[PDB]
Design a protein around this ligand. Structure first.
Ligand SMILES: O=c1cc(-c2ccccc2)oc2c(O)c(O)ccc12
Ligand SMILES: [Mg+2]
Ligand SMILES: [Mg+2]
Lengths: 292, 286
């Protein structure tokens, strides 16, 4: 029913987890912040696994391709996870591009990427050719906007030149407007760079990352997931919680990240139903009281 | 000193009653090819209903954990968890991740072995795009083994910092028709000889396979029954880990080979107990 931003504890926690077949975790602000894990996060994943609960992971962070992201999980103390459980915006972008650019061998094209090496590596793993890689650059058939620490006026100009070709696709990893750093400062997100590309090119980007439903499609392509039996746990109302509502999942806001309980309750008072979490917890460690 | 005694009657009830769990080898114990050992699914059921933990080891490096879990279910073993399955492929992937904590791994092996390494976050030589420095060579069961591939492996091993790992040293494996196929131990011997290197072996009887289990589960070896069909791998493994060993006769090794080891004083290759098949163990449960 309508979300009420209720604190998940006691019987409500036991019932919700007991009926759930799996949990879908956002990563940044949920499992960790920078190099600091959320206390109790590794133990939660273990007890979820021993309870027969499936776990999957989403993230709009495109800094690490799947191999390095799996190494990060293991290094930070999350054991027993498999790389195929990890669904970043980089992975989903590579899938979409592969799906859309699959065709005659003589007509494969190249992807112009505004983003970092991890994003480039994820596209290469999918078989995509990248503009700027060694050797002649084939016809650019798509522009991909991601988190780009090297964003520049000249490369923005170059992306838009490619987009003058109406057959050149425009894809964005996500629309996150900004991201918090350890020192309290903020960094602009793909949403800010996408707004620049979209405005200068007059185009609408295809967005793969949450809250876009495509990110869930990527999961369902690999795993049988009953959304009505899946908990969506995230820290950002405008991405994770909206994502859950669009996919029909029960949404849980954790307060270890971007969004606050006051922001959530403000959405409820305004009747903005799809941005109101069904439940909330101080941290995902609070969920362990519903197991054993 | 083990005496390879037929486990039956009261001894069977005492042994199973005191055990917290059973560690099963897979090939030759639970099945042979696509033909399950009669009564094997029922045994696992009754073990579960008795509160007995069950774990599974295998030097078979052909199947990644998901496909191995599917195999169990397809053959009639229900209610098992992928976290209970410890193949040499899985343990090899874990060792390489630790040692390389990354570079890329040149794999002499099949898709299941490659998939297991990819699932652990390791990059593989020959995969699309990234061309990292090869920091390890992994030898597994490789039906594509060739002179050219052996030559490539040795070229990487000219770098003294490139690790050499082998999934196991099983010399050969039996097929349904009575024929045999060369095992990883034969291919590792070629790689080791041509490179002048000694390989790190993860699979039983190497103790690392047990380290992989104990990292995931609290296992008291003194209360665990190691059930296998191969004296030189399963039984030796059990002795090295301090487990009570049970030889089943549905697989590679014979009771005469076991009694030959007892006559020669090779304690670590003599099973503590033996059964014609693991179905005989069901009589100690109720
Ligand atoms: O997509 C990215 C998201 C983030 C991020 C930073 C702080 C909090 C949450 C997410 O950082 C990145 C980064 O540092 C890179 O080098 C490349 C990509 C990303
Ligand atoms: Mg987040
Ligand atoms: Mg065997």
């Amino acid at each position: 029913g309508m979300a009420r931003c209720e604190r998940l504890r006691g019987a409500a926690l036991r019932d919700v987890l007991g009926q759930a077949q799996g949990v879908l975790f956002d990563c940044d602000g949920v499992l960790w912040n920078g190099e600091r894990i959320v206390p109790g996060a590794p133990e939660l994943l273990q007890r979820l696994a021993r309870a027969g609960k499936n776990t999957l992971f989403v993230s709009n962070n495109s800094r690490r391709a799947r191999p390095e992201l799996a190494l990060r999980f293991a290094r930070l103390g999350f054991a027993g996870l498999r790389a195929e459980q990890l669904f970043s915006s980089a992975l989903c972008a590579a899938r979409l591009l592969r799906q859309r650019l699959s065709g005659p061998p003589d007509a494969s094209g190249a992807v112009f990427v505004l983003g970092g090496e991890g994003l480039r590596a994820e596209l290469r793993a999918a078989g995509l050719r990248l503009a700027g890689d060694p050797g002649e650059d084939p016809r650019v058939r798509a522009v991909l906007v991601g988190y780009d620490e090297q964003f520049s006026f000249s490369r923005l100009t170059e992306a838009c030149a490619h987009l003058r070709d109406p057959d050149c696709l425009l894809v964005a990893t996500d629309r996150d407007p900004w991201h918090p750093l350890s020192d309290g400062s903020r960094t602009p997100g793909t949403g800010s760079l996408a707004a620049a590309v979209e405005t200068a090119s007059g185009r609408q980007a295809l967005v793969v990352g949450k809250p876009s439903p495509y990110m869930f499609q990527c999961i369902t392509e690999d795993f049988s997931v009953d959304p009505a039996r899946t908990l969506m746990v995230g820290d950002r109302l405008e991405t994770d919680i909206l994502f859950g509502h669009r996919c029909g999942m029960t949404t849980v806001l954790t307060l270890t990240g971007v969004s606050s309980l006051e922001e959530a309750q403000a959405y409820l008072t305004a009747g903005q139903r799809d941005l109101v979490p069904h439940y909330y917890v101080e941290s995902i460690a609070d969920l362990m009281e519903g197991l054993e």
